[PDB]
Ligand binder design. Sequence first.
Ligand SMILES: CC(=O)O[C@@]12CO[C@@H]1C[C@H](O)[C@@]1(C)C(=O)[C@H](O)C3=C(C)[C@@H](OC(=O)[C@H](O)[C@@H](NC(=O)c4ccccc4)c4ccccc4)C[C@@](O)([C@@H](OC(=O)c4ccccc4)[C@H]21)C3(C)C
Ligand SMILES: CC(=O)O[C@@]12CO[C@@H]1C[C@H](O)[C@@]1(C)C(=O)[C@H](O)C3=C(C)[C@@H](OC(=O)[C@H](O)[C@@H](NC(=O)c4ccccc4)c4ccccc4)C[C@@](O)([C@@H](OC(=O)c4ccccc4)[C@H]21)C3(C)C
Ligand SMILES: *[C@@H]1O[C@H](CO)[C@@H](O[C@@H]2O[C@H](CO)[C@@H](O)[C@H](O)[C@H]2NC(C)=O)[C@H](O)[C@H]1NC(C)=O
Ligand SMILES: *[C@@H]1O[C@H](CO)[C@@H](O[C@@H]2O[C@H](CO)[C@@H](O)[C@H](O)[C@H]2NC(C)=O)[C@H](O)[C@H]1NC(C)=O
Ligand SMILES: *[C@@H]1O[C@H](CO)[C@@H](O[C@@H]2O[C@H](CO)[C@@H](O)[C@H](O)[C@H]2NC(C)=O)[C@H](O)[C@H]1NC(C)=O
Ligand SMILES: *[C@@H]1O[C@H](CO)[C@@H](O[C@@H]2O[C@H](CO)[C@@H](O)[C@H](O)[C@H]2NC(C)=O)[C@H](O)[C@H]1NC(C)=O
Ligand SMILES: *[C@@H]1O[C@H](CO)[C@@H](O[C@@H]2O[C@H](CO)[C@@H](O)[C@H](O)[C@H]2NC(C)=O)[C@H](O)[C@H]1NC(C)=O
Ligand SMILES: *[C@@H]1O[C@H](CO)[C@@H](O[C@@H]2O[C@H](CO)[C@@H](O)[C@H](O)[C@H]2NC(C)=O)[C@H](O)[C@H]1NC(C)=O
Ligand SMILES: CC(=O)N[C@H]1[C@H](O[C@@H]2[C@H](O)[C@@H](O)O[C@H](CO)[C@H]2O)O[C@H](CO)[C@@H](O)[C@@H]1O
Ligand SMILES: CC(=O)N[C@H]1[C@H](O[C@@H]2[C@H](O)[C@@H](O)O[C@H](CO)[C@H]2O)O[C@H](CO)[C@@H](O)[C@@H]1O
Ligand SMILES: CC(=O)N[C@@H]1[C@@H](O)[C@H](O)[C@@H](CO)O[C@H]1O
Ligand SMILES: CC(=O)N[C@@H]1[C@@H](O)[C@H](O)[C@@H](CO)O[C@H]1O
Ligand SMILES: *[C@@H]1O[C@H](CO)[C@@H](O)[C@H](O)[C@H]1NC(C)=O
Ligand SMILES: *[C@@H]1O[C@H](CO)[C@@H](O)[C@H](O)[C@H]1NC(C)=O
Ligand SMILES: *[C@@H]1O[C@H](CO)[C@@H](O)[C@H](O)[C@H]1NC(C)=O
Ligand SMILES: *[C@@H]1O[C@H](CO)[C@@H](O)[C@H](O)[C@H]1NC(C)=O
Ligand SMILES: OC[C@H]1O[C@@H](O)[C@H](O)[C@H]1O
Ligand SMILES: OC[C@H]1O[C@@H](O)[C@H](O)[C@H]1O
Lengths: 756, 756
Amino acid sequence: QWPAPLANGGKSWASAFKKAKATVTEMTVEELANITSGVIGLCSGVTGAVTRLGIPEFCLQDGPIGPRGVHGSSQFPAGLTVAATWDRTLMYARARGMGQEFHDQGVHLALAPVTGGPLGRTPLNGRGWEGTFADPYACGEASYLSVKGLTDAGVATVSKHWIAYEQETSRNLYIDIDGVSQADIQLPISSNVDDLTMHELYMWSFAEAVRAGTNHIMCSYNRINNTHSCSNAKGLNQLLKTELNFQGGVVSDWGGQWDSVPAAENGLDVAMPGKGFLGALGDFWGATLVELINNGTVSEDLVRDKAVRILTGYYYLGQDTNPPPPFVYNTIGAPTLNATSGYRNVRKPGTAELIKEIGSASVTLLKNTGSLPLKHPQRIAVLGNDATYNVLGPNACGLANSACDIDNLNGTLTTGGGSGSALSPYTITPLEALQKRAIEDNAEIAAVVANSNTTTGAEDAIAALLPDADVTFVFLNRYSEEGADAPDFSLGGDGDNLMDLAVTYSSNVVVVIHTTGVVDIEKWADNPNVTAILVAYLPGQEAGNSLVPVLYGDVAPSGKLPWTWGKSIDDYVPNGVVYTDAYSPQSNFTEGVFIDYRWFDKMGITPRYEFGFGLSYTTFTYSNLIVDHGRWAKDYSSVMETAEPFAEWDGTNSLYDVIFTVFATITNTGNLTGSEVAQLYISIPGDNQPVRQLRGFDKIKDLPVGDSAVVTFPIRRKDVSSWSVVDQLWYVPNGDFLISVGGSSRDLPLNTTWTP
Amino acid sequence: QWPAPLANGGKSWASAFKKAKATVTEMTVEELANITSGVIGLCSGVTGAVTRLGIPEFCLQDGPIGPRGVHGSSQFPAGLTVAATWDRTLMYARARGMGQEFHDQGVHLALAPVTGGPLGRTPLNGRGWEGTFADPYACGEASYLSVKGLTDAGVATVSKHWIAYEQETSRNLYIDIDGVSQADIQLPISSNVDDLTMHELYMWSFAEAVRAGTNHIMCSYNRINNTHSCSNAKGLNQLLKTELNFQGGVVSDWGGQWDSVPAAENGLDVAMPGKGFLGALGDFWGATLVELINNGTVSEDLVRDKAVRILTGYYYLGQDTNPPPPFVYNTIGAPTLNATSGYRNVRKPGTAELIKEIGSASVTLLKNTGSLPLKHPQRIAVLGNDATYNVLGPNACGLANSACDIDNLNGTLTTGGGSGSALSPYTITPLEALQKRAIEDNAEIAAVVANSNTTTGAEDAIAALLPDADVTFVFLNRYSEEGADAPDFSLGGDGDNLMDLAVTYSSNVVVVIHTTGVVDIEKWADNPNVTAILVAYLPGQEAGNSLVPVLYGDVAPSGKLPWTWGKSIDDYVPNGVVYTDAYSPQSNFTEGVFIDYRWFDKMGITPRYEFGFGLSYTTFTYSNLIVDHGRWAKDYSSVMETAEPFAEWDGTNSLYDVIFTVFATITNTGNLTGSEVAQLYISIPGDNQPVRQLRGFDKIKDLPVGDSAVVTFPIRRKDVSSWSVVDQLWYVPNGDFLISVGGSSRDLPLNTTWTP
Ligand SMILES: CC(=O)O[C@@]12CO[C@@H]1C[C@H](O)[C@@]1(C)C(=O)[C@H](O)C3=C(C)[C@@H](OC(=O)[C@H](O)[C@@H](NC(=O)c4ccccc4)c4ccccc4)C[C@@](O)([C@@H](OC(=O)c4ccccc4)[C@H]21)C3(C)C
Ligand SMILES: CC(=O)O[C@@]12CO[C@@H]1C[C@H](O)[C@@]1(C)C(=O)[C@H](O)C3=C(C)[C@@H](OC(=O)[C@H](O)[C@@H](NC(=O)c4ccccc4)c4ccccc4)C[C@@](O)([C@@H](OC(=O)c4ccccc4)[C@H]21)C3(C)C
Ligand SMILES: *[C@@H]1O[C@H](CO)[C@@H](O[C@@H]2O[C@H](CO)[C@@H](O)[C@H](O)[C@H]2NC(C)=O)[C@H](O)[C@H]1NC(C)=O
Ligand SMILES: *[C@@H]1O[C@H](CO)[C@@H](O[C@@H]2O[C@H](CO)[C@@H](O)[C@H](O)[C@H]2NC(C)=O)[C@H](O)[C@H]1NC(C)=O
Ligand SMILES: *[C@@H]1O[C@H](CO)[C@@H](O[C@@H]2O[C@H](CO)[C@@H](O)[C@H](O)[C@H]2NC(C)=O)[C@H](O)[C@H]1NC(C)=O
Ligand SMILES: *[C@@H]1O[C@H](CO)[C@@H](O[C@@H]2O[C@H](CO)[C@@H](O)[C@H](O)[C@H]2NC(C)=O)[C@H](O)[C@H]1NC(C)=O
Ligand SMILES: *[C@@H]1O[C@H](CO)[C@@H](O[C@@H]2O[C@H](CO)[C@@H](O)[C@H](O)[C@H]2NC(C)=O)[C@H](O)[C@H]1NC(C)=O
Ligand SMILES: *[C@@H]1O[C@H](CO)[C@@H](O[C@@H]2O[C@H](CO)[C@@H](O)[C@H](O)[C@H]2NC(C)=O)[C@H](O)[C@H]1NC(C)=O
Ligand SMILES: CC(=O)N[C@H]1[C@H](O[C@@H]2[C@H](O)[C@@H](O)O[C@H](CO)[C@H]2O)O[C@H](CO)[C@@H](O)[C@@H]1O
Ligand SMILES: CC(=O)N[C@H]1[C@H](O[C@@H]2[C@H](O)[C@@H](O)O[C@H](CO)[C@H]2O)O[C@H](CO)[C@@H](O)[C@@H]1O
Ligand SMILES: CC(=O)N[C@@H]1[C@@H](O)[C@H](O)[C@@H](CO)O[C@H]1O
Ligand SMILES: CC(=O)N[C@@H]1[C@@H](O)[C@H](O)[C@@H](CO)O[C@H]1O
Ligand SMILES: *[C@@H]1O[C@H](CO)[C@@H](O)[C@H](O)[C@H]1NC(C)=O
Ligand SMILES: *[C@@H]1O[C@H](CO)[C@@H](O)[C@H](O)[C@H]1NC(C)=O
Ligand SMILES: *[C@@H]1O[C@H](CO)[C@@H](O)[C@H](O)[C@H]1NC(C)=O
Ligand SMILES: *[C@@H]1O[C@H](CO)[C@@H](O)[C@H](O)[C@H]1NC(C)=O
Ligand SMILES: OC[C@H]1O[C@@H](O)[C@H](O)[C@H]1O
Ligand SMILES: OC[C@H]1O[C@@H](O)[C@H](O)[C@H]1O
């Protein structure tokens, strides 16, 4: 039903396309199959060279916190962490700093960012932390800035994972290793997604990634409507390549490809990893593709378009004129690849400070009963291994932060597990930073950082230490990892046990959570002995020194939640992860657009902490909502353009034109300076529409006591539109639109109406 | 044979004595027995009050690194550590800083310093680390300065332990607890010590303590010639109170007293702890003493002299006019004493910097093959739990640093175990300090700090980490404790195992030893993969930041060994610790004056590292020895004077007159600034005399490249004398005296002769 549309180079890539087409028109069939399937090298993926035309191998490298598996680089905080800052400037700079290091390590294509897959359908998603917000609009924006950041350095982006990749359980990558094949055990989970939900929820952040100029897109492990994402014609040829007008390459996830011909015809451009990882994850193209073209079952022209889309990026970013230096690190690992590593340091001055600032900007205050900010306590207790180093070393858990023992004391959770992680040159531990500050105050400080259930004496130590303390810091964590979902919301390690002891022996307990996602603090959150609670997410290498200034009052906490914190897992969307032995496992997205806070608001469920909630050390009063109908503007900035049909289209016009801008005022109404993240939600009228939909945020910085600032919200056409499944286009529905503004999805003291 | 001589107040205490005598002449018998036996309180010992005469309870408090069992204080480095600096200025300042804190915590009498018991007869002595050098002269000097330091603050000193207390094994303190009495199992080890050895070896450092004005002296647990030290008339009434003319009090060690009448007549003044510690350690005086006086078996006058000697100190230090504040801490511990603690911070600005400076001045370089000082390594590995915190907290091992489990990862060994330890407000770990410095150099750094034998993965982690490192730091330790000797010289914990792995996977291994004494590094010391070796002893709270500047070259290492480092325990004095079940265990000091280096030199044994050995980062050339016969001076300074008979005595004259001064020159002959510790040894002629005897040291500070300085050695009469057992006096023997000067007991390039 959907033929494969040819690349034309779209907006910004027009000249790169032309050079790309020149080069591809010279290529033989043996060379087309080379560039378009992975070969063996030091990087996660490597396209074969076209050595006669002077085109080298492309290093395709993990991952969304920066080049994975290398020394000489920095461990940036995770997508989850930057989203929690709600600060567009840090979202950009994070990505640009990642890009610099990617480039300087010799990566042509970054396997990043994660731009909407997983988006957020389960809070138990094992790799959910790799993305940003559980919300199409906010994810959309963070995705735009992350892409832009990486491309503005020399690196091509492979935005991932397209699409509806919402559980790790039964993701079932193609693998055939030691005679058992995943095709023989179980098919990948089928995400069954209606057309409205696909357009309004899952496609939104990918459109943004496409607008920002992603050079490529990774197709996911899941099947969509019982068809593999990487050979889904409706997915890749229609929705991505026609409607979103995508001009770059689809890259398979590693084992994302299940067949040769359907993938060649339904939208895949690059077979990865091909000959790498021993060919264990399927090796469907290469010489098999040459043979398919020469015997005439696969169009040679079709395959030229694949090569065209791979080279467009190469030429647009100027990788011919300004090549990256050689990649020097064995990031695959022996015995799978025996090969020696060189060494390069790419840590630039500024980067460490940026990583810190992100941490200081993200850490989210969930509860404060008066214990914070700390003045100058004299006797300080610290509990939890999370407070200090991994007992085996910061990088002991290996190339993907996932090979340490089940019970190992891993230390401060600075990134999650999997392909999304990265090595660290050190960890500034929360204990080191608390101690530095205790020393300044001539105070004492003592940590119990062992396993409190299993190490002799730990329990008695904690009993002996806590009573005399002015403050007890308890550091908790929750490791999760690619390739599995969390079974429940319960804390990692000895966390529950720590918290029972802590509140048994101290009435001034301050809780800090390093985590990949929501966790169960129900037993203690309303204990008055727990005086304060903060989530620091995954702060990367600067964990301790980003946190302590916030604790001590040097800066007010300013982060707010990028997803919903429900009291129980039962309060979320049902069937968030499906567990079957069924050969063809199915996940029917019956919830529709209603994920995260949309689920909560539609069904009248009260979270513990809502989407976009965060405490400061001061308060903010909202006033003087203004809807400026006259403050509208054309769509100029975008690197690339989509072809999303929409009803109001004429010759010169766009779905991303700003049709009005909204203003409001905040006043710092408390007794301290703070920054505030203002949020704007629109209720679009219609049948089965969410109560509220986030369509703007804006972060006021360091607003002094009693001062005021205006907060500004440009609204796009798309931002007020619905998808018509009958007409197959975006339209702006007739009706009354509620527009609300405030500190969170549930603290919105200003509202007005807008009718089109 | 030896009657108890009456106090007269000697030199400096004459006016205190008079006030003391006034007060005691008013006292009833019930009051004399009160002041003179211990009662229940918050301090290690407490004398009863004389409330009618306005005399309060005296807090007697542990210990030789500063007030034990308190919060709000600093953990000073140990006696062993300060001795290794060989710097008289730091020996003084250490003690004065301790004294300040003692005073400010409300201690009247400090159970410190350790001034010659144990001196050094075994290298396995479990509490050997509490003293200073294994050498009478050097110990003597450190003892003088330590006493002086504490008394110049408001605190009375209880110098310990008198005398020949040279093993912990069978020390057998009197205890009777739950119906088993130590009197029923085994008598204390009998130190059997000839008269020459007692005078020339064991009494020397106590004479110095007495000269410096110790207010009191603790009598030891051991027996001497099968008589309890605390009821030994020859010991306390003759040698201490007559010959050394001691004017202050003998205090029993806790369980040091075994009887009522002999102790009252043979020289004991204070029964400790009396009613404290449940009376479990003997309670021989109190009401029993009142009953002994009133029935006329103990002279009332004798007991008045006891009270006189206790009050002299009280009045001399001005504890009436300027009382210490209240002692506020329960340092005994529940259930033995149920009582609540208050809080006081006495940490003065300067103290932390002094503690650091001592560390930086003591750490001793034993081997350096070119790896030190470090330039700017980029990849740094660290091994050993000693590198980081105690996993249970710095103070988890309790009031005497000795209650943690046998296998517990205690972290950096900053002090030893027992009554000599102290709490710590923090520990600046070697890892923290190495990391700070790595960060400055844009480098990476990773530690494996778990148990390398028992924790899953640790071995693989170390294999994966070490090969790529520029440098591997391995941190080793050896805990020892009061009440036991070390069984052998072998490293604590996983140390052996660490070192096998380290040299298996790295050829640039730098070893740092935190320890209470000599340890066995024989298997690795000549491995060329071990590029450098340093012993940091017990640095107290500032371990990491005192060490790292030395490693990185900011200051050249300047410490030298305060004892001998033999290749095997068999190379030391035989029968260093006697192990019997024999009811009356015996230790016959047949070696004589020949302990530590004297044993080694007399028998032609080559240590690995000799007494007074230490490497710098530069070299020193010695020249131009001068013996100035005309540079002599009277004995003015001493706070108190002894009555040691000596042959050359006339009316006005003294054993501590300087009879000549010796000079030499050092030149910094290498390529860096360094400090040098010059040593002077005299060979006194006679029958069975040591090859060499240390009689001077002098530390030149920060001598620039190619510059020179004179090093100066005043020699006392006593310094050239022998004890005549026939005549019972100190005499200067006729004969030829060799005088040698140089960098160590075995690197003495200058020598001359002196004849009297
Ligand atoms: C299954 C898989 O995802 O493999 C890859 C290799 O390319 C894939 C991309 C992936 O991002 C990458 C690089 C990762 O970074 C993952 O975080 C990652 C994994 C998720 C992990 O894969 C798993 O845990 C699989 O569930 C696990 N699967 C199975 O054991 C399995 C075998 C037969 C049938 C069905 C399943 C597996 C373990 C070890 C090797 C291969 C497969 C292997 C892997 O070593 C890593 O795997 C290898 O390095 C590797 C794979 C095959 C052969 C040789 C090496 C992994 C790490 C780094 C730990
Ligand atoms: C035996 C002894 O030295 O006791 C004292 C109490 O005053 C002594 C002075 C000593 O310096 C002091 C304070 C210490 O600081 C020691 O480091 C110290 C010890 C060496 C230790 O003593 C021992 O380990 C003994 O070998 C051990 N001895 C025996 O178990 C024993 C019993 C009967 C016959 C023969 C031997 C012991 C353990 C616990 C209580 C009493 C005795 C007890 C003690 O708790 C500490 O002991 C107590 O606090 C205590 C003693 C008796 C009753 C109640 C409390 C210890 C510490 C702090 C651990
Ligand atoms: C297909 O790709 C391979 C792998 O990139 C090319 O072989 C490499 O070519 C480079 C130069 O581009 C050589 O330095 C390497 O030695 C080659 N590697 C290996 C493993 O052989 C190969 O030339 C490409 N084929 C064609 C037809 O261009
Ligand atoms: C997956 O299945 C859904 C459900 O059938 C598809 O939804 C239909 O899409 C067409 C246009 O493609 C519309 O005219 C129908 O009315 C849609 N139905 C619903 C219920 O939404 C969806 O497009 C399929 N997606 C893929 C990727 O195959
Ligand atoms: C420390 O990290 C390791 C991985 O490096 C964690 O071990 C994995 O935990 C998951 C559960 O999320 C299991 O499904 C895996 O099988 C474990 N991996 C291995 C290799 O055993 C470990 O849970 C972390 N430590 C703590 C205390 O959470
Ligand atoms: C013997 O000493 C005891 C203990 O120090 C004296 O009793 C204490 O006296 C102080 C004042 O000096 C009181 O505040 C305490 O309440 C007393 N403590 C106890 C436990 O009773 C006692 O007075 C002294 N006896 C004589 C005769 O002076
Ligand atoms: C312990 O025993 C030794 C050995 O008998 C005593 O040494 C004698 O001391 C007297 C003077 O007190 C001399 O005249 C003897 O010649 C000494 N003999 C030796 C072999 O040195 C020693 O004084 C005794 N010490 C104590 C503390 O009792
Ligand atoms: C950590 O310190 C503890 C004491 O706080 C050490 O345990 C003692 O070790 C000695 C041997 O020197 C035994 O005789 C004692 O019985 C032990 N004490 C207890 C209470 O069990 C321990 O050895 C130290 N840890 C390491 C690794 O050396
Ligand atoms: C606007 C919209 O979402 N409409 C419905 C849609 O159902 C489609 C649609 O009515 C039309 O194209 O015909 C088919 C075939 O009978 C029908 O399935 O999508 C949802 C289903 O999830 C409907 O409930 C909507 O009302
Ligand atoms: C100077 C000296 O040490 N002399 C000897 C001493 O032995 C004594 C001494 O000879 C004299 O007082 O008489 C008694 C009794 O016969 C004798 O023991 O000490 C040592 C013993 O350790 C002798 O070997 C010395 O020669
Ligand atoms: C336009 C498109 O791509 N898809 C279909 C098309 O079959 C139909 O003719 C159109 C009416 O405009 O409605 C959509 O359901
Ligand atoms: C003086 C002294 O205290 N002790 C004795 C003494 O018995 C003897 O008369 C004297 C000769 O001067 O020799 C010592 O052995
Ligand atoms: C790497 O070397 C190991 C032996 O150490 C061997 O098992 C393996 O075959 C090698 N790997 C490859 C891909 O050849
Ligand atoms: C709070 O802590 C105190 C100890 O400070 C304890 O006695 C009390 O039971 C605790 N309260 C709760 C609700 O846990
Ligand atoms: C201290 O209290 C405990 C009970 O917790 C008791 O066993 C003991 O008798 C008390 N100690 C003293 C010396 O009275
Ligand atoms: C020194 O280390 C290397 C690894 O760098 C190892 O191969 C060699 O066996 C080691 N030598 C000794 C003497 O331990
Ligand atoms: O780059 C991350 C993705 O690419 C590969 O490494 C894996 O297939 C995914 O986890
Ligand atoms: O002060 C130390 C000494 O005093 C008491 O605490 C014990 O008897 C000895 O170890």
